[PDB]
Amino acid sequence: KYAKRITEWPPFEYMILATIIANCIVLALEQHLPDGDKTPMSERLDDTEPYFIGIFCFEAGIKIIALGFVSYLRNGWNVMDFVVVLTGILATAGTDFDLRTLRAVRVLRPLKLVSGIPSLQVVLKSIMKAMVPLLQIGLLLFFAILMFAIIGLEFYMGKFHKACFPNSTDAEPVGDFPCGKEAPARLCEGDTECREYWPGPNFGITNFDNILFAILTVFQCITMEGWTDILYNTNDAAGNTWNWLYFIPLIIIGSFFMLNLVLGVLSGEFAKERERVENRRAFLKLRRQQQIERELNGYLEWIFKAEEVMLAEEDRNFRRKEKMFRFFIRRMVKAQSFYWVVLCVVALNTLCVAMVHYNQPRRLTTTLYFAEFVFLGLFLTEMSLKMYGLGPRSYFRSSFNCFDFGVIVGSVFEVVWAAIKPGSSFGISVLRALRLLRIFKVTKYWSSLRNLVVSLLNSMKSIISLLFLLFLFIVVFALLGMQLFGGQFNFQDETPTTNFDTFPAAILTVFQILTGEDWNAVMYHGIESQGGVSKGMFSSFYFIVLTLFGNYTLLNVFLAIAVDNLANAQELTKDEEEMEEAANQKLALQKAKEVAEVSPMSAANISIAARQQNSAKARSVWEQRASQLRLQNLRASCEALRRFCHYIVTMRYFEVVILVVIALSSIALAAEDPVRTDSPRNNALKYLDYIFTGVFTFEMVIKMIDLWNILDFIVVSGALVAFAFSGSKGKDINTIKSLRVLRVLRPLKTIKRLPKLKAVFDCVVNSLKNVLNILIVYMLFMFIFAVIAVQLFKGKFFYCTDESKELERDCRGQYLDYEKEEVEAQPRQWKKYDFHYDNVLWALLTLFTVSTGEGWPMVLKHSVDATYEEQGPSPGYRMELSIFYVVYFVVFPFFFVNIFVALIIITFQEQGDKVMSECSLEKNERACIDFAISAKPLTRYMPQNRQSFQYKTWTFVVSPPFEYFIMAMIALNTVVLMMKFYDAPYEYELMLKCLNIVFTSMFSMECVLKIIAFGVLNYFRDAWNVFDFVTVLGSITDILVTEIAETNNFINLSFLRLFRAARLIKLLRQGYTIRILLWTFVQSFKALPYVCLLIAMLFFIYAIIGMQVFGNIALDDDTSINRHNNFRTFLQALMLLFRSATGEAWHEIMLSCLSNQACDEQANATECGSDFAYFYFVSFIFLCSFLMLNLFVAVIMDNFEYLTRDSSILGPHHLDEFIRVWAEYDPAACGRISYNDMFEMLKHMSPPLGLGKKCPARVAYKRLVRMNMPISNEDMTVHFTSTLMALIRTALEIKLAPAGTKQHQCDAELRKEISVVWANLPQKTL
Ligand SMILES: CCCCCCCCCCCCCCCCCC(=O)OC[C@H](COP(=O)(O)OCCN)OC(=O)CCCCCCCCCCCCCCCCC
Ligand SMILES: CC(C)CCC[C@@H](C)[C@H]1CC[C@H]2[C@@H]3CC=C4C[C@@H](OC(=O)CCC(=O)O)CC[C@]4(C)[C@H]3CC[C@]12C
Ligand SMILES: CC(C)CCC[C@@H](C)[C@H]1CC[C@H]2[C@@H]3CC=C4C[C@@H](OC(=O)CCC(=O)O)CC[C@]4(C)[C@H]3CC[C@]12C
Ligand SMILES: CC(C)CCC[C@@H](C)[C@H]1CC[C@H]2[C@@H]3CC=C4C[C@@H](OC(=O)CCC(=O)O)CC[C@]4(C)[C@H]3CC[C@]12C
Ligand SMILES: CC(C)CCC[C@@H](C)[C@H]1CC[C@H]2[C@@H]3CC=C4C[C@@H](O)CC[C@]4(C)[C@H]3CC[C@]12C
Ligand SMILES: CC(C)CCC[C@@H](C)[C@H]1CC[C@H]2[C@@H]3CC=C4C[C@@H](O)CC[C@]4(C)[C@H]3CC[C@]12C
Ligand SMILES: CC(C)CCC[C@@H](C)[C@H]1CC[C@H]2[C@@H]3CC=C4C[C@@H](O)CC[C@]4(C)[C@H]3CC[C@]12C
Ligand SMILES: CC(C)CCC[C@@H](C)[C@H]1CC[C@H]2[C@@H]3CC=C4C[C@@H](O)CC[C@]4(C)[C@H]3CC[C@]12C
Ligand SMILES: *[C@@H]1O[C@H](CO)[C@@H](O)[C@H](O)[C@H]1NC(C)=O
Ligand SMILES: [Ca+2]
């Protein structure tokens, strides 16, 4: 039994890894066919299973006979291996048919190589240790969903079951939209009536019939996938007046707030983890290695200089004459002239390669073909001459030179491979555009951008491990999907492409679900495959998981990578700059030392050059927090007429009137009718615009007599020109429209007038300027990808209307469309796909749409189906091209976009301080003392009579079992709140109503008991008691309304039910970690309202612009501009803008209004719509994303002190416990309290602060004795003013004990730091 010492060798471990990889390949080679069909390879691979099972069992047996049982089973990975082998053995000996739950375990086999490689185990532990603090967020998220689900269950229960059945002939609805009989809901057209019962919108899956369906629908909504479809279904089922008030708060809270919480928690976790001893040591090693290299390079340059100096004096007096040539070459390959020449050559090559487009002239094609050879030869001659003038070892030292060599080799391979078989092309020749990255060399941003690449290369193994772990999880989920839905997607209609039949299809489906686009469609297909709504509805959980741990795990990989690398680069750059400054000042100070024969002026020179550059120390919040965390960790480790037109603008009440006129003009702009130009409202608006432009020009003309003013000049001049052209016929009506839409800039004038709005706009602009270099790099990478995509896909995105024809000449005439069983004659026409890659601009637009994530499966399908230059598509022709898109998703949406967030997180500047010299010592200590400054020991108001009646009620109410009963009563009432379902029996609804009755009665009894035991003016003091009373009163009003027959049409009262649905909030107070986080983030939100004002102004401006431009588009169904989504009104425009901001079909909306749309039969122009929608939508998406990210980072950095807590010396929270303890023992302040209570209070005090063990109590005595005593005054005196202050002073930054006599200086420091407190603490210092 000595297997461990003779059978646990490296080579045996690599034989077990080969068994696993082979098993993975066998699993990936399986194919699933419907209805029991099987390929011969299926049986051939099935015959391979028992050898794998035998090998696994042998390895398990060796490990058992080496380690024992319950220490071999003590490892979780060994437990997983044992479970896998046991399930395999049972399957081998299993003849019964209930093996599906056992054969689905063999998808965990790829996870076994995680156990075989401990490095992957360490990486997985590191990635999963940052997800525990996210769990509470998920809990909160679940609560939110539950709450919203309940609200849905109370409003949209069985509302989607009505449809326009024509005449009850065969019960086939004509339209897939809900009804309302008369009412403001949507009506049937033609000979149809809305009969009862029709499954629902999506096969009857998305509805609010019961709590489970409501929960699933709300979860689908929060992921912002198809929530607008549900919104429109509610709109046309019950009217559009109040449905937005349910979905807009739902989307906001469930997506934006959750994402902000996740980002903040992750940022705090990363900041805490970066300052650990291991990471700090690794960073110090990297910094030392980088610092050595600069000195080495300087010394080698010095050495080369001497080698070329001792070679000219050695020849001045064959194999030597060829070496001055090498020296001259090396002096030539390093000069600025050669650098600029090669940079211009690379720029010209980029220009030449960027002109490729579909249907280019043959002369241009030949010119580019020859220029490729010319450029390849030139680049080859610049890589050989620079390699001989520097040497192979010195040339390969720089990483970008290695990249250049790789690109040259790939280009040569492409050139030789493009002649022996000219088909498509890889596109490596475009990669030379990355050589433009030399531009940053001549700027001052070279060090910062180079340090990021240095840090990226330093931790390459970690990046590879993380990517491989992600790929392994994707493979495991693909195998699970293959087992669950493999071969079950063969429906009566066309089989969906997004299926789980083969391994490539399953892995593409899993990747698409990970991105989060159209995952609900795949979920619907899976549910339909598993039986439908009736049975098989439990197959959704898979997708649920694949969403959750698929949408918050990438944010834990790529965001972590970005934060770590960018923080490392920033710290490296800052340390390099400060070390250079220190070395320069030391050298200049030493300069004066050698010159002792005269008074030196070097000291003055270094003095005048030491403060001018000092004003560049930004010291962002992230850097300050990192420094404080480093200090704390190190301490813990160690311790173990001109005047008549200028006085009018000087008036105090002149800016306010201008602001109110600006607001009035903005409101008048909002309330405009685009579709009906000729209306009395439009005439009144024109008359008001006359007054507005008159007052604007009047105030403007008196301002020039004494950038933003430039904008005011354009506004005024455009208004004047429009008025001048108004008094004539329609001369150049397009110019009139342009000058009319120019008036939207009126709200922009408010930015300067409000100092706070101007400040926040300046902060946003500064944040934008902070990421300009990364934006340029991102644009260069996107351009390279777009050029490659143009090269790959130009011309191939053409298709005929019917798939039978493959050529343009064949796609002529008419064909038979066999849709909806009508076989209609439809014209054949050779069309082009909406999003293509004809030229670089179209490719850039398509890649932007892909990066946003909308409709990228469609472009993936089109790219895969593309065949040739002028030939129609063929399904699955080139599947490998999907790699391209995968790579794109790895680089832009995932990587590049996550380094934008990090670059804003780590460089965010504090705004509420605006100065770094306030106290230089307190960041949380100041807040900790201010908490005691403001929070007085508020009491619980114990009754003072206690004679016969009030004391009994008070004792009953404040009793712990009463609170427990209320909690159980509030938790059991929520169980009866979600237990309602559609088409329930009458007795069931009666029981539900009776239970609601008794619960409301119990809560009313509790409220009246509290009123009696506390008092009218005491119960209402609490903000929670008044909320409870409001909910009780609302429930009573609802129950009274319900008992009496409801007013059918007099007053529509159905909102009061929400009050009862509010009881959930009543149970939100039990959690001691969700309340303190929710309240903290809400209080940070309420402290930054001007960011929200800026976002609202952005939405207002874009809504007005859309109203003016695309307002009169004709409403048509089966499009993106219809009765649900249009630009007609201000509310409709805002809804469209919000839908695009979340992102549903913004590309489809853009295409639905481009310069050729059929125009409404009520407006003036017969052809309305413009090609301006491209810029409109792209700019709106970019700006909305940027401002939302800025708001998120502002909120996160407002709370960074709490998000990086490291809770062991916490002070902001222990004061709450102190107040809670003091309140119970104190009925009222009464000035002063006794002494003996404080000892039992310290005993009952939280052990985290004050006493850990029995021994530290002595230290507490050392804090009570051996210093100044408050016993000088009356012993009947409070001590909280002197106890908590002393404990918070001595817990951190203790100074009195080492001195023992310098108390007066500490008191003076405290006084000068509390200078303006209105002398309130002077009486508390004693
Ligand atoms: C940590 C998680 C915290 C979660 C907090 C959640 C906060 C947001 C909650 C949003 C709830 C308000 C929106 C209600 C959705 C309205 C749905 C609807 O269609 O209502 C119409 C309804 C009658 O339907 P109607 O079509 O008019 O008639 C035919 C069919 N009966 O009724 C009507 O006739 C109109 C009445 C509905 C519109 C007004 C309702 C009051 C809204 C006040 C503002 C929000 C109050 C928030 C209260 C929080 C606690 C619930
Ligand atoms: C990286 C730097 C050096 C590139 C600078 C920009 C140009 C190289 C790009 C930007 C605009 C691109 C143009 C974008 C739009 C067009 C129009 C296009 O012309 C046609 O499509 C005519 C055929 C037809 O539609 O019938 C030819 C490509 C061209 C000029 C592109 C050629 C390459 C251009 C000129
Ligand atoms: C300062 C910002 C928030 C813009 C103003 C807020 C808007 C949401 C409010 C303020 C004025 C409201 C407008 C107040 C007056 C009207 C006119 C109203 O139409 C009619 O009065 C019917 C008369 C006719 O049929 O001609 C339509 C709503 C509308 C523009 C309202 C739409 C919503 C508006 C634009
Ligand atoms: C963090 C990353 C690594 C996640 C994705 C891992 C990729 C390597 C996966 C996801 C997409 C997979 C691709 C999904 C689709 C295809 C096409 C397909 O190629 C075929 O020729 C299929 C053959 C057939 O038609 O039956 C299989 C390889 C490839 C690119 C797969 C290879 C492995 C890929 C590239
Ligand atoms: C001073 C501004 C900012 C506030 C007042 C502007 C809005 C509320 C005013 C300006 C002109 C007004 C319109 C003038 C004419 C008509 C025609 C008729 O159908 C009655 C209502 C209606 C449609 C008015 C509704 C209210 C209206 C749109
Ligand atoms: C790291 C950054 C700069 C990405 C640069 C590499 C990109 C452009 C490379 C990496 C892998 C490459 C793909 C690899 C394989 C194929 C299959 C071939 O039949 C067509 C080209 C295609 C689809 C390539 C296109 C270009 C591609 C996506
Ligand atoms: C906390 C959980 C476990 C118990 C409280 C949840 C109760 C109220 C929920 C959980 C699952 C729900 C059931 C889920 C499915 C159905 C089938 C439907 O055709 C009638 C309603 C019915 C029977 C639901 C009634 C309410 C229900 C029982
Ligand atoms: C002025 C600001 C928005 C700078 C952005 C300018 C560019 C991106 C925008 C501003 C106005 C736009 C124009 C507005 C209207 C039309 C008419 C249409 O039939 C063809 C396109 C064309 C000519 C647009 C092209 C793009 C355009 C020039
Ligand atoms: C069937 O249609 C006719 C007219 O097409 C109309 O009377 C009604 O909708 C139906 N007739 C019935 C229900 O008798
Ligand atoms: Ca979407």
**DSSP string computed for 704-757:** H---HHHHHHHHHHHHHHHHHHHSSS-TTHHHHHHHHHGGGGSGGGHHHHSHHH
Looking at the chain, after which residues does the C atom sit over 2.5 Å from the next written N, breaking the chain?
70, 317, 640, 706
CB within 8 A of 393, min separation 6: which ones? none
Backbone angles phi, psi at 1175, to 5 degrees: -60, -40
HSE-CB at 1148 with a 13 A cutoff on CA atoms is 18
Q: Is 285 in the pocket of ligand 3 (CB under 6 A)?
A: no
CA distance 1014 to 7: 77
Q: Is 1279 within 8 Å of 1270 (Cβ atoms)?
A: yes
Ligand 4: distance of its center to the CA of 1026 in Å? 60
CB within 8 A of 747, min separation 6: which ones? 662, 666, 1097, 1100, 1101
Closest residue by Cα to residue 1103 from 668, 667, 670: 670
Residue 1080 is which amino acid?
Answer: T
Task: Tell whether 229 is in a known binding site.
Answer: no
Task: Calculate Rg over the CA atoms of the chain.
Answer: 37
Give the length of the chain: 1326
- Reduce the DSSP state of residue 194 to 3 states and report it: strand
Residue with CA at minimum distance from ligand 1 atom 40: 1055
Q: Is 511 in the pocket of ligand 4 (CB under 6 A)?
A: yes
Place of tokens 């976002």: 1095
Relative to beta strand 830-832, strand 798-800 is antiparallel
Residue with CA at minimum distance from ligand 3 atom 18: 671
Helix axes 554-594, 621-639, angle to 10 degrees: 80
CA distance 680 to 686: 10
Q: Is 1167 in the pocket of ligand 8 (CB under 6 A)?
A: no
Backbone angles phi, psi at 426, to 5 degrees: -65, -45
Residue with CA at minimum distance from ligand 4 atom 8: 471
CA distance 944 to 1102: 62
Place of tokens 């399904």: 875
Q: Is 425 within 8 Å of 791 (Cβ atoms)?
A: yes
- Reduce the DSSP state of residue 163 to 3 states and report it: strand
CB within 8 A of 1279, min separation 6: which ones? 1235, 1238, 1270
Written as six digits, the tokens of 492 are 């009566």
CA distance 1323 to 1308: 14
What is the DSSP secondary-structure string of 280-331?
Answer: HHHHHHHHHHHHHHHHHHHHHHHHHHHHTTTTTTTT---TTHHHHHHHHHHH
DSSP bridge partners of 868: 871
- The DSSP letter of residue 257 is I
Relative to beta strand 814-817, strand 824-827 is antiparallel
Contacts 24+ apart (CB under 8 A), 589-595: none
CA distance 116 to 106: 17
Residue 4 is which amino acid?
Answer: K
- Reduce the DSSP state of residue 1022 to 3 states and report it: coil
CA distance 1266 to 1290: 14
Q: Is 667 in the pocket of ligand 5 (CB under 6 A)?
A: yes
Task: Tell whether 1237 is in a known binding site.
Answer: yes
Ligand 6: distance of its center to the CA of 884 in Å? 5
- The DSSP letter of residue 1272 is G
Print burial letters for 647-656: b (CB count within 10 Å at least 16), e (below 16).
Answer: eeeeeeeeee
Residue with CA at minimum distance from ligand 9 atom 8: 167
Ligand number nearest to the C-alpha of 350: 2
CA distance 73 to 79: 6
HSE-CB at 1100 with a 13 A cutoff on CA atoms is 21
Written as six digits, the tokens of 346 are 């690379």
Closest residue by Cα to residue 902 from 620, 617, 575, 1180: 620
Relative to beta strand 824-827, strand 1167-1168 is unpaired
CB within 8 A of 722, min separation 6: which ones? 736, 739, 740, 742, 743
Which residues does ligand 2 sit against, CB inside 6 Å? 350-351, 354-355, 357, 359, 839-841
Which residues does ligand 6 sit against, CB inside 6 Å? 424, 426-427, 788, 880-881, 883-884, 887, 891
Residue 1164 is which amino acid?
Answer: N
**Distances from the Cα of 372 to the Cαs of 367, 382, 785, 1123, in angstroms?**
9, 15, 19, 53
Residue 862 is which amino acid?
Answer: H
Burial of 1299 (0-12, 13-18, 19+ CB in 10 A): exposed
Written as six digits, the tokens of 50 are 């028992």
DSSP count for the chain of H helices, then E strands: 59, 8
Ligand 9: distance of its center to the CA of 191 in Å? 7
CB within 8 A of 1225, min separation 6: which ones? 1237, 1241
- The DSSP letter of residue 440 is G
Written as six digits, the tokens of 186 are 């949507």
DSSP bridge partners of 1113: 1159
Ligand number nearest to the C-alpha of 191: 9
Q: Is 454 in the pocket of ligand 5 (CB under 6 A)?
A: no
- The DSSP letter of residue 490 is -
Closest residue by Cα to residue 621 from 1202, 131, 1213: 1202
Q: Is 1313 within 8 Å of 1322 (Cβ atoms)?
A: no
CA distance 1032 to 1001: 9
Residue with CA at minimum distance from ligand 9 atom 11: 167
Q: Is 675 within 8 Å of 1160 (Cβ atoms)?
A: yes
Closest residue by Cα to residue 716 from 759, 667, 658: 658
For the CA atoms of 67, 73, 79, 81, the dihedral, rounded to the nearest 10 degrees, stands at 10
- Closest ligand 4 atom to 879 CA: 17
Going 308 to 312 to 313 to 319, the CA torsion angle's sign is: positive
Cβ neighbours, 10 Å, residue 379: 22
CA distance 1309 to 1299: 15
DSSP bridge partners of 798: 832
Ligand number nearest to the C-alpha of 190: 9
Ligand 9: distance of its center to the CA of 1048 in Å? 29
**Distances from the Cα of 102 to the Cαs of 83, 97, 109, 1061, 1270, in angstroms?**
10, 10, 13, 43, 74
Residue with CA at minimum distance from ligand 6 atom 11: 884
Q: Is 588 within 8 Å of 563 (Cβ atoms)?
A: no
CA distance 793 to 796: 6
CA distance 885 to 1270: 74
Cβ neighbours, 10 Å, residue 1171: 11
Task: Tell whether 591 is in a known binding site.
Answer: no
Written as six digits, the tokens of 1011 are 């009123």
Helix axes 446-458, 277-307, angle to 10 degrees: 120
Which residues does ligand 7 sit against, CB inside 6 Å? 210-212, 975, 978-979, 981
Going 1260 to 1264 to 1267 to 1268, the CA torsion angle's sign is: positive
Ligand number nearest to the C-alpha of 880: 4
Question: Of 209, 215, 537, 979, which is best to mutate to test ligand 7, by the most ligand atoms within 8 angstroms of its C-beta?
Answer: 979
Residue with CA at minimum distance from ligand 3 atom 24: 681
Question: Of 248, 667, 746, which is best to mutate to test ligand 3, by the most ligand atoms within 8 angstroms of its C-beta?
Answer: 667
Cβ neighbours, 10 Å, residue 1182: 12
Closest residue by Cα to residue 674 from 160, 1114, 1088, 118: 1114
- Reduce the DSSP state of residue 913 to 3 states and report it: coil
**Distances from the Cα of 935 to the Cαs of 938, 1209, 1285, in angstroms?**
8, 20, 13
Burial of 867 (0-12, 13-18, 19+ CB in 10 A): middle
* Resolution as reported, in Å: 3.1
Task: Tell whether 863 is in a known binding site.
Answer: no
Closest residue by Cα to residue 333 from 397, 395, 399, 398: 395
Ligand number nearest to the C-alpha of 1078: 1
Element (H, E) at 1003: helix 986-1014
Per 3-state DSSP, what percentage of the chain is helix, strand, and coil (rounded to 5)?
A: 65, 0, 35
Task: Tell whether 81 is in a known binding site.
Answer: no
Helix axes 772-793, 840-852, angle to 10 degrees: 110
